[PDB]
A paper describes a structure:
The von Hippel–Lindau (VHL) protein is a tumor suppressor which functions as the substrate recognition component of the multi-subunit Cullin RING E3 ubiquitin ligase complex (CRL2VHL). Besides VHL, the CRL2VHL complex includes the central scaffold subunit Cullin 2, the adaptor subunits Elongin B (EloB) and Elongin C (EloC), and RING-box protein 1 (Rbx1).1−3 As the largest family of E3 ligases, CRLs are responsible for ∼20% of all ubiquitination events through the ubiquitin–proteasome system (UPS), a cellular machinery implementing the degradation of intracellular protein targets, such as short-lived, damaged, misfolded, and also oxidized proteins. HIF-1α hydroxylation triggers molecular recognition by VHL, leading to ubiquitination and subsequent degradation of HIF-1α via the proteasomal pathway. Small-molecule VHL binders can act as competitors to the native substrate HIF-1α and stabilize HIF-1α levels, upregulating genes involved in the hypoxic response, consequently affecting hypoxia signaling.
In general, these ligands adopted the typical binding mode expected for hydroxyproline-based VHL ligands, maintaining the key interaction network between the protein and the LHS of the ligand. The three methyl groups of 30 pointed into the solvent and were not engaged in specific interactions with the binding site of the protein, which might have affected the dihedral angles. Hence, the experimental dihedral angles around the phenylene connection to both the benzylic carbon (271°) and the thiazole carbon (60°) were very close to the calculated minima. Considering the results from this assay, compound 30 (Kd = 37 nM) constituted one of the most potent VHL ligands known so far. As in the FP assay, ligand 30 again possessed the highest affinity to VCB with an SPR-derived Kd value of 25 nM. The most promising candidate, ligand 30, also caused a maximum enhancement of HIF-1α and HIF-1α-OH protein levels in both HeLa and HEK 293 cells. In compound 30, both features were realized to generate an exceptional VHL inhibitor capable of most potently increasing the intracellular level of HIF-1α.
Author numbering:
A (entry chain I), F (entry chain F): 62 to 203
B (entry chain G), D (entry chain D), I (entry chain J), J (entry chain A): 1 to 104
C (entry chain H), K (entry chain B): 16 to 47, 57 to 112
E (entry chain E), G (entry chain K): 16 to 47, 58 to 112
H (entry chain L): 62 to 202
L (entry chain C): 62 to 204
C-alpha cells in the first residue's frame, strides 16, 4: 500500500532536526518495508541524496515516538527547482498529555516492572503498547 | 513577545499571559476582572520585591525565555485588608510522594 | 477574558482561561458552570495540567520549533493517572 | 546596565556584578577566576531553569531593577565531579529568632 | 581583582571583593584572605555583604539613592554586627 | 555661627524631594535658630520663595534623620539666572549600617522599652541619642 | 521635535513637546526628559498640558483669545497643582 | 502720577470687546481717581467720545479681572487723522493657570467660605486678594 | 490653520499639533518619532472609525474649531502585537471627587 | 471586618481574631501555629456542621456583628488520631453557684 | 504573635494573645514561662475575663460607639473578686 | 478652679447620647457648683444653648457613673464657625472590669444588704463608694 516509487529521478533534501530528540529517518522501500537510516543528533542537519516519489517518515531513535516532518507524517521528495534542495523540517508534535506521560514513565520503568506500578490495569496495557512503525503503517493502510 | 505567568496569592493561582511590553498596572487590571479587587488594593511582587505600576514586565525580568508556556513565572499577589495590606503569602503546592522502587 | 476555576484535592484553586480549558473535551462537558472540583488530583499535579493547557494552545499549529513538555519523574505516575481519567 | 548577583552553590555565596549585555559564559569565566573551575564543568541556573552559555543575562531575566546592590539576584551553581553534574543544592541561610515583645 | 572569604557562624562562606570588605576597618585588621565570625549568623552577614555593594554604588551618587532594606526580625542582630564591624 | 543673612534679595527655589521620606525643611533664622517649615511628601516638588544667603537643611519629618540636599548637609539659594529657580535635590544619605539599624529599631520599639533590649549598655545610649537638629548644628560649628 | 514625558500619580503618561513645557520655569528646572508628579492626578495633569498648548498658541497674539475652560469638579486640584508649579 | 491730561481736545474711540467677558471701561480722572463707565456686553462695540491724553483701563465688570487693550494695560486716545476713530481692542490676557484657577474658585465659593476649603492657608489669602483697580495703580507707581 | 490633538493608547497620551491639510500617514510618522514604532504597525481612529493613511485630517472631521489648543481632539492609537493588531484601548483619566459643599 | 472567635476542643479554648473574608483553611493554619498540628488532621465545626476549607468565615455565618470581642463565636475543633478522626467534644465550663439572697 | 495559656481551677486551658494578657498587671508578675494556674478562678469566670481582654484592646481609644460589657448576675460576684485580684 | 467663665457669648451645642444609659448633663456654675440639667434617653439628641467658656460633664442619671464627652471628661462650648453648632458626643468609657462589676452588683443589691455579701471587707467599702461628682471634681481639681 504505502510504497516508494522507483522513479530513478534524483532529488537532494536537507534533513533538519528541529527537535530535542535524536531522529531516526525511516525510508519505506519498494516492498513497503521500513528501513532505518543513519540517525541525526538534536539540532543537526545533513544534506542527503534521495529520489522523487520516495516515502520517508521520522521517529525518535531511542523510543520510536512519532515525529512530524513539515507538519505532516510523510515526506515525499519533489523536484529540486533551480538546484535548491527540498527542505525537510523534523519537529516535535504537540503530544497529548497522556502520551507524554507514557513516554516519561517508559523511560523510567523497565518493561518487566510495568505491571508492578500502582495504576489501573488499562495503563499497564498502554505502557506495553510501545510505539512501533510497522503497526502504524497498517493503521493508515486500513 | 508573549510572557506566561502564574499570579499566586494564598491558595489562589491565576494562569495568564501578557506582553513583555505590558505594564504592572495592566496586569493588575486582569486580576481585577477575575478576583474583583481594584488595582488600588493590589500589590504585585517578583519574589519579595514590590513591583511599580508603571514598569513593564520585561523590565521586571519577565521575558519570553524565562516566562514560558510550559513553565511560567510566578508573580506574588497581596490584597488590602480594610486599611493595611496583608503580607505576601503563597501556599506551596502539595509535595509529591517518594519515587517507587521500580522508578528509582 | 473568560476564566474558569479548577480546584484540586488539597484545596488549591487554579484559574485558567476558558478557551485554554476547552482543550479538554472532558472539562468542557464538565462545565456545561464556572467551577469544577477534582477530589483526587493534588495541586502538584493539577498545576502541571494547567501548564499543559497553555503549552498546547501556544504551540499547536506551529512551524517554529516546539519545545518538549517537561515532566519531573516524581510526578510522572500521578499525572498519568490524571491524564487517563481526563483523556487529555 | 549593571546587575548585582549572588552565585550560590551549597554553602558558597559569591558577590559580584556584571552587565545586562554579558553572557552566561562570561559569568562562568568570572566563577572560573574565583572558584578555579573551568566553564565546561559549570552549569548556571535561574531558579530551576538551566542557563545557556550564549544567552545574555538580561535575556535570562536578570535586569538592573531586579538585580540590585541592596538585594541581588540569586544564580544557582552546579559542578561536574567527573562526567556527571550534581543536582542543584543551595543551602538555606540561618533562621532569625522570633521577636522580642518589646519590639512586636 | 582580589577576593576575600567571610565565614559565618553556621558555616556559610561568602566570597566578596577585597576592596568592598575593607570598608570595615575591623575586617581589615583581621586580614593583616579568610575570616571566621562567631556570633554572626549567615542571615546577618548576607545583608552586610550587600551593604557593602550598596555603599560603594550609591556613595557619592547623583542618581536617586534607595532605602537600604533591613527586615525587622534581623534588625537587632545586624545592629550588633554593625557595632562590632564599625561599618 | 551658622545663620542666614538678611539680604532682602529674593531667590526662588525648587524643593525637590527625591527620597522615600516625608521631608521637613528647616530654615536657620538670622539669630541661628532653626525654624521648621511645611513638610513635603515623597516624590513631591514645591516652588518657594527665599533669599540670597539664607541657610536651609532637611530632616525626616517623623524622626529628624539627616537628609542631604544637593549631596551636602546645607543648602544656600544663589542667583536665579534668567529668572530660572534654583534646584534643591533632597535625597537619602548613604547611612552607616549602624545608624540605619538604629533607625529600624527606633521605629519598632517605644523609648520606654529601650533599656529592656538585650544589648550592650553602649547601644542603649546609642538608641536614646536619636537625631536632633540643634545637636547636629553645634557639631558642624565645632 | 523633542518631547518630554509627564507622569501623573495614577500612572498616566503625557508626552508633550519640550518647547511647550519650557513655558513653566518649574518644569525647566525639573528637567535640568521625564518628570513624575506623585501629587497630581491625570484629570489635572491633562489640563495642565492643555494649558501649555494654549499659552504657546495665544501668547503675543492679536487674534481674539478664548477663555481657558476649567470644569468646577477639578478647579480645586488644579489650583493646588498650579500653586506648587507656579505656572 | 497716573492721571489724565485736561487737554480739551476731542478724540473719538471705538471700544471693541473682543472677549467673552462683560467689560468695564475705567477712566482715570485728572485727580488720578478711577471712574467707571457704562459696561459693554461681550462681543459688542461702541463709538465713544473722549479726549487726547486721557487714560483708560478695562476690567471684567463682575470680577475686576484685568483685561488688555491694544495688547497692553492702558489706553490713551490719540489724534483722529482724516476722521478715522481710534480703535481699542479689549482682549483676554493670557492669564497664568493660577490666576484662572483663582478666578474659577472665586466665582464658585462665597467670600466667607474660602476658609472652609481643603487647601493650604496661603491659598486662603490668595483667594481673598481678588483683583482691585486701585491695587494695580499703586503697583505701576 | 492648525488642529491640536491627543493621540491616546492605553495610559499613554501624546499632545501634538498638525494642519487640516496633513494626512493620517504623516501623523503616524510623528508617533513613530515619539514611540519608535513604524506606521505599518499603527492604527489611528477617530472614535471607533479607522483612519485611512491617505486621507487628510480635515476630511476625517478634525477641524481647527473642534480640535482646539485648550481642548484638543482625541485620536485613538492601536499597535500591532507581533502579527495581529491589538484592540483600541484608552484608559480613562481619574475621576474627580464630589464637589465640596462650600462650592455647591 | 474583624471577627472574634473561641476555638474549642475538649478543655482547650483558643481566643483569636480573623477576617470575615479569611477562609477556614487559614484558620486551620492559625490553630497549627498554636497547637502544632497540621490542617490535614484538623476539622472545624460551627455547632455540628463541618466547615469546608475554601469557604470564608462570613459565608459560614461568622460576621463582625455576631462574632464580637465581648461575646465571641465558638468554633469546634476535632483532631485526627492517625487514621480516624475523633468525635467533636467540647467540654462545658463550670457552673455558677446559686444567686445569694441579697441579689435576688 | 505569641500566645499564653491561662489555666483555671477546673482544668480549662485558655490560650490568648500575650499582649492581651499583659493588660493584667497581676498576670504580668506571674509570667516573669508561658503558662499560669489560677487555683481560685473557675472557668466561667476566666473565660469572661479573657473576653474582657479582647474588649479592652479593641475599643480603647476609639471614637466608634463603645458597647456595654455584659456581665450576667450569676457571675458578677466571682468576676468582681477575680477582677480585684487581677487588677484589670 | 474648675468653673465656667461668665463670658456672655452664646454657643449652640448638640448633646448627642451615643450610650445605652440615660445621661444627666451637669453644668459647672461660675462658682464651681454642679447644676443638673434635663436628662437624655439613650440614642437621643438635644440642641441647647450654652456659652463659650462654660463647663459641662455627663453622668448616668440613675447611678452617676462617669461618661465621656468627645473622649474626655469635660466639655467646653467653643466658637460656632459659620454658625454650625458644636458637637458633644456622649459615649461610654471603657470601664475597668472591677468598676463594671461593681456597677452590676450595685444595680442588683440594696445598699443595706452590701455588708451581707460574702466578700472581703475591701470589696464592701468599694461597693459603698458609689460614684459622686464632687468627689470627682476635687480629684480633677487636684490634677
Ligand atoms: C546512504 C544514505 C544515508 C543517508 C542519511 S539519512 C540520515 N543521515 C544520513 C547520512 C541519506 C541518503 C543515503 C543514500 C546516499 N541515499 C539512499 O539510500 C536513497 C534514499 C532513498 O530514496 C532510497 N535511496 C537509494 O539509493 C535506493 N536506490 C534507488 O532508488 C535507485 F538507484 C533506483 C534509483 C536504494 C536504497 C539503493 C534502493
Ligand atoms: C511660608 C513659606 C513656605 C514654604 C514651604 S517649604 C515646604 N513647602 C512650602 C509651601 C516656602 C516659603 C514660604 C515663605 C513664602 N517664604 C519664606 O519664609 C522665606 C524662606 C526663607 O528664605 C526666609 N523667608 C522669608 O520670607 C523671611 N523674609 C525675609 O528675609 C525678608 F523679607 C527680609 C528679606 C522671613 C521668614 C519673613 C523673615
Ligand atoms: C458719558 C460717556 C459714556 C461713554 C461709554 S463707555 C462705555 N459705554 C459708553 C456709552 C463714553 C463717553 C461718555 C462721555 C460722552 N464722554 C466722557 O465722559 C469723556 C471720557 C473721558 O475722556 C473724560 N470725558 C469727559 O467728557 C470729561 N470732560 C472733559 O474732558 C472736557 F470737557 C474738558 C474737555 C469729563 C468726564 C466731563 C470730566
Ligand atoms: C434650659 C436649658 C436646658 C438644656 C438641656 S440639657 C439636656 N436637655 C435640655 C433641653 C440646655 C440649655 C438650657 C438653657 C436654654 N441654657 C442654659 O441654661 C445655659 C447652659 C449653660 O451654659 C448655662 N446657661 C445659662 O443660660 C446661664 N446664663 C448665662 O450664663 C448668661 F446669660 C450670662 C450669659 C444661666 C444658667 C441662666 C445662669
Amino acid at each position: 500500500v504505502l510504497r516508494s516509487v522507483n522513479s530513478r529521478e534524483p532529488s537532494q533534501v536537507i534533513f533538519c532536526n528541529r527537535s530535542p530528540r535524536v531522529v531516526l529517518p525511516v525510508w519505506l522501500n519498494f516492498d513497503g518495508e521500513p528501513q532505518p537510516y543513519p540517525t541525526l543528533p538534536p539540532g543537526t542537519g545533513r544534506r542527503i541524496h534521495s529520489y522523487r516519489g520516495h516515502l520517508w517518515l521520522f521517529r525518535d531513535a531511542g523510543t520510536h515516538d512519532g515525529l512530524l516532518v513539515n507538519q505532516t507524517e510523510l515526506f515525499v521528495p519533489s523536484l529540486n527547482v533551480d538546484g535548491q534542495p527540498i527542505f525537510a523540517n523534523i519537529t516535535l508534535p504537540v503530544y497529548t498529555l497522556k502520551e507524554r506521560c507514557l513516554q516519561v514513565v517508559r523511560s523510567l520503568v523497565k518493561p518487566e516492572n510495568y505491571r508492578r506500578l500502582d495504576i489501573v490495569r488499562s495503563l499497564y496495557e498502554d505502557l506495553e503498547d510501545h510505539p512501533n512503525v510497522q503497526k502504524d503503517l497498517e493503521r493508515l493502510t486500513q | 513577545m508573549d510572557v506566561f505567568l502564574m499570579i499566586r496569592r494564598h491558595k489562589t493561582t491565576i494562569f495568564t499571559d501578557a506582553k513583555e511590553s505590558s505594564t504592572v498596572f495592566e496586569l493588575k487590571r486582569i486580576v481585577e476582572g477575575i478576583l474583583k479587587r481594584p488595582p488600588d488594593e493590589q500589590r504585585l511582587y517578583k519574589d519579595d520585591q514590590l513591583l511599580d505600576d508603571g514598569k513593564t514586565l520585561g523590565e521586571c525580568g519577565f521575558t519570553s525565555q524565562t516566562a514560558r508556556p510550559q513553565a511560567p513565572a510566578t508573580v506574588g499577589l497581596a490584597f488590602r485588608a480594610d486599611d493595611t495590606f496583608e503580607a505576601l503569602c503563597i501556599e506551596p503546592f502539595s509535595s509529591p510522594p517518594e519515587l517507587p522502587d521500580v522508578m528509582k | 477574558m473568560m476564566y474558569v476555576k479548577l480546584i484540586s484535592s488539597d484545596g488549591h484553586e487554579f484559574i485558567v482561561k476558558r478557551e485554554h480549558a476547552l482543550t479538554s473535551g472532558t472539562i468542557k462537558a464538565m462545565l456545561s458552570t464556572n467551577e469544577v472540583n477534582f477530589r483526587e488530583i493534588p495541586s502538584h499535579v493539577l498545576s502541571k495540567v494547567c501548564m499543559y493547557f497553555t503549552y498546547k494552545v501556544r504551540y499547536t499549529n506551529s512551524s517554529t520549533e516546539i519545545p518538549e513538555f517537561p515532566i519531573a519523574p516524581e510526578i510522572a505516575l500521578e499525572l498519568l493517572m490524571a491524564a487517563n481519567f481526563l483523556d487529555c
